């Protein structure tokens, strides 16, 4: 199949920046009737994916000048002239010449802001929680930037990779930040069998992980 | 105007089949290409096939020969999608797009598809306690079907709250969701967590108090 290189992966930009992506295909999507079906489009979260440019240079109908597709043979570029809040999301490219059709991995336009070290706080289950037989340690690792992050649970100081639970927000609206949360569920009869419980975060603002911990 | 209608929400039980619908107006049916495509939750897009209507030629990703089934009416300009045996994988938006050869295609608005063997459940909803500024939560668990809707003080508190995507563990989700207050008003003052599960018709609170 036709592999779709998209470059860069994330693109943090400023309101007003120029920005530019790249899509970069294995060979050829030239098709055999002479044009090149290579299409871009911009998804938003819980949306369905907006076409914004087909084959290679075409705006589609009601899609802003400020957009524009430009490449030949398999290398292809797609512009915008000063980015508005709206241009931010996830941007494929999909390429229509060779079945199976393939599209690029995405890129990620999101709005740059000052890097931030994640406010970290950590829960023990409820009473309540307990009371039903369950068990379930909460991590927050709230408003960081940039949005990649690793989160580590110990349980009496020993890692813990069983029955962890993962979920990330979007961007924030207001101050562009991430956040996650991590979930580490254990049955009632094993959390009273230890004492310590540690969620540790690694962000890139430190070399040192931000380290939480409660004990029973 | 080209517009393609794509049939509702699915809860489909693990190993079931189903069927999804996409139908088209605005145009010559008999004469446009019609493709589906797949994303799962956070992942990119991925093409499932190709199906001409008008002459019920077809072509599919090799990755889904043995799971997706094209097929059409077109007394009722309405094409189908069938997704045999299902499983976690495939639990995803399914989109389908139209286009005249050679011209641009149009966007249907996708159809989520959640595998899942539970049936309605509300949610368990539990305190999150701590052990200038302080940080709750609450932990909203073991409810099915998505969505449930979480506010702080009935809505007041707005203000430095996250919450969460839900995932799905044990075939029923499972979400959290934090704010973050001045020290000056918690406990002096009163957080509550509130939580609407539409599917079951309830309500509850949970008031945050300190262990
Ligand atoms: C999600 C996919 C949307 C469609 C992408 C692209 O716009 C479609 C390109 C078509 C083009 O219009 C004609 C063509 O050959 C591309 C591939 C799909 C049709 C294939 C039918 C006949 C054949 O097999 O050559």
């Known amino acids: 199949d036709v592999l779709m290189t998209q470059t860069p992966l994330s693109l943090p930009v400023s309101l007003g920046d120029q920005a530019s992506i790249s899509c970069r295909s294995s060979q050829s999507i030239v098709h055999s009737n002479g044009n090149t079906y290579l299409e871009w489009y911009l998804q938003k979260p819980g949306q369905s994916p907006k076409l914004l440019i087909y084959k290679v240079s075409n705006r589609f109908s009601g899609v802003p000048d400020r957009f524009s597709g430009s490449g030949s043979g398999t290398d292809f570029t797609l512009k915008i002239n000063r980015v508005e809040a709206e241009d931010l999301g996830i941007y494929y490219c999909?390429?229509?010449?060779?079945?199976?059709?393939?599209f690029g991995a995405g890129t990620t336009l999101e709005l740059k802001r000052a890097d931030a070290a994640p406010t970290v706080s950590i829960f023990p289950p409820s009473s309540e929680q307990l009371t039903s037989g369950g068990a379930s340690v909460v991590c927050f690792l709230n408003n960081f930037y940039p949005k990649d992050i690793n989160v580590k649970w110990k349980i009496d100081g020993s890692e813990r990779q069983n029955g962890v639970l993962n979920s990330w927000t979007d961007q924030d609206s207001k101050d562009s930040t991430y956040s996650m949360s991590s979930t580490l569920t254990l049955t009632k009869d094993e959390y009273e069998r230890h004492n310590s419980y540690t969620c540790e975060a690694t962000h890139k603002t430190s070399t040192s992980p931000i380290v939480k911990s409660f004990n029973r | 105007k080209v517009q393609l209608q794509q049939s509702g929400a699915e809860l489909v039980k693990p190993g079931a089949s189903v069927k999804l619908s996409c139908k088209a107006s605005?145009?010559?049916?008999?004469?446009?290409?019609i493709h589906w495509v797949k994303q799962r939750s956070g992942q990119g897009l991925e093409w499932i096939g190709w199906?001409?209507?008008?002459?019920?030629?077809?072509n599919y990703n090799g990755k889904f020969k043995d799971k997706a089934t094209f097929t059409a009416d077109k007394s009722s300009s309405t094409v189908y999608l069938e997704l045999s045996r299902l499983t976690s994988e495939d639990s995803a938006v399914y989109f389908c797009?139209?286009?005249?050869?050679?011209?641009?295609?149009?966007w249907g608005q996708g159809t989520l598809v959640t595998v899942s063997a539970a049936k309605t459940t509300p949610p368990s909803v539990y305190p999150l306690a701590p052990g200038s500024m302080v940080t709750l939560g609450c932990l909203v668990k073991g409810y099915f079907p998505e969505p449930v809707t979480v506010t702080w003080n009935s809505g007041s508190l707005s203000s430095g709250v996250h919450t969460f995507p839900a995932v799905l563990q044990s075939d029923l989700y499972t979400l959290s969701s934090s704010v973050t207050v001045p020290s000056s008003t918690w406990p002096s003052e009163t957080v509550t967590c509130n939580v609407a599960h539409p599917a079951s018709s309830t309500k509850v609170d949970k008031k945050i108090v300190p262990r």
């Open positions: 797009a139209s286009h005249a050869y050679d011209k641009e295609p149009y």
């Open positions: 605005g145009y010559t049916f008999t004469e446009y290409f």
């Open positions: 199906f001409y209507p008008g002459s019920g030629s077809l």
């Open positions: 999909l390429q229509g010449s060779h079945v199976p059709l393939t």
